[PDB]
Symmetry: C2
């Protein structure tokens, strides 16, 4: 009989030694990635703020906090933001940010907490709800579908809709998987939210279970600036997976999470969307208003 | 030929989802363990505080920060303490605590940074060195010996000593491995630093490479209070390894770090220590006064 014997269990920590895979070549390059995506776009900044002001929103919940890029922007712009994420590895960066600028009143009232979409309703006190709830950056696409049916999906979206106060808003997006699925290719460097200063190639792998798109895996070969000899760069790789959400299905889901009592409109990239339009967007943004 | 596919690389994180092994059975029991190892003991508090004031120490550096328990106590007692650890999963606990109390002037001036003994000199600006440097809780034991020759142990101990200003202190301990090694057993719940409210069983495994104890692994079976049926307690386990440091060798190692210019004193559990003495200590605390 063969047996495996590890130093410490998967998941535990120990004073003095880095956590399990903190220094892998992958975690390394990944830090370059989540870093490189900070250079917020003008089109993006003007669009979100306008939408929010146009609706008189004020207290907003960011359910895909990440390193806190979209939240810091709402914070500096006077909104009363409460940010939550399920990933502690990414949450650590927002927390660092808050602490640095903690001397600023606006940053001292910024609430960052850990929450999970699947249990959101019990992790974050909605109270009367929020004005705008936001889930941008194709972040919902991370939640895989383990049970076959999209039960987990429906659960997260329902909870997410839960934090939206009546007459309130929900701004959630997804990448254009309708196009990725038909091309088999997900163009890199193609972003609308943040300008990428890093260079990368992207290998798109699509897993089709019996006959239904089940997952899209992306392999990022990032060119790291000065990891070569006479200045030349190096090439490290890392991988991430997403659930290929189609405009039609997602549209059914998000609406069904509101029980039908909602206002739905899907934007192309940042401009309106009408099926049949020559323009194929990289992102599909959904802005739902809670009418009941 | 075979091949294996992962959803995402080992070490990367994604917004809507929990980090890699954050919710494993072992990680869940482990959180309990570290959360039920904070009830500080009076002997410790008095001993530590006394030794520090007796030497008129004010700037203290905690290199085995952990959840901050040792440091919180020092910050609470007016000391100028900067805390570092190489484990984010743990550092996360001290950061949180600092925020919740960021309104108390003392807790506002508490520096919690990330650092590695191996590169301690590069991560922390000692300037002229700290008054005291502490590494309690048998935390040094965590650094394993990967090269065979305790090079890393030496490097770690060198950097650590260098943070000590002349006339300054260095308090560093390790468990009584001599006793463990000869008994093959490391008694559980037997702590001098904190009082454990948890009930646990411990299986000790000693890996003796050619003929030198090379490692000590402990499998903690914790009896979780209400994970059973009619109130009954559940039973879950986790493991952690340590490098078996013997008093004789660790003593050479620690002095070797100060280049010999130091005053060394090894304490029993908290009382002085003299070979052959009837009382067998659980811990060996080493206090080294840097004489230059």
């Amino acid at each position: 009989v063969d047996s495996v014997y590890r130093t410490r269990s998967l998941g535990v920590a120990a004073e003095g030694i880095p956590d399990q895979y903190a220094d892998g070549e992958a975690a390394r390059v990944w830090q370059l990635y989540i870093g490189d995506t900070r250079s917020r776009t003008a089109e993006y900044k003007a669009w979100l703020l306008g939408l929010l002001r146009q609706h008189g929103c004020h207290r907003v919940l960011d359910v895909a906090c990440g390193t806190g890029v979209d939240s810091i922007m709402l914070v500096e712009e006077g909104f009363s933001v409460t940010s939550v994420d399920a990933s502690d590895k990414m949450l650590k960066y927002a927390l660092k940010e808050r602490w640095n600028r903690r001397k600023e009143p606006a940053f001292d009232k910024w609430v960052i907490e850990e929450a999970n979409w699947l249990t959101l309703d019990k992790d974050v006190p909605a109270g009367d709800g929020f004005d705008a709830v936001i889930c941008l950056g194709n972040s919902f696409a991370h939640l895989p579908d383990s049970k076959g049916d999209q039960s987990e999906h429906r659960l997260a979206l329902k909870n997410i809709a839960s934090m939206v106060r009546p007459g309130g808003l929900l701004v959630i997006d997804h990448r254009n998987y309708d196009y990725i699925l038909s091309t088999g290719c997900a163009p890199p460097g193609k972003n609308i939210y943040y300008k990428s200063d890093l260079t990368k190639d992207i290998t798109t792998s699509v897993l089709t279970v019996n006959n239904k798109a089940h997952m899209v895996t992306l392999d990022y070969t990032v060119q790291v600036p000065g990891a070569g000899r006479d200045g030349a760069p190096g090439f490290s790789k890392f991988r991430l997976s997403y659930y290929p959400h189609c405009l039609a299905s997602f549209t059914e889901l998000v609406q069904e999470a509101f029980g039908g009592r909602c206002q739905h409109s899907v934007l192309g990239d940042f401009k309106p969307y009408r099926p049949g339009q020559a323009y194929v967007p990289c992102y599909f943004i959904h802005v739902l208003k809670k009418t009941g």
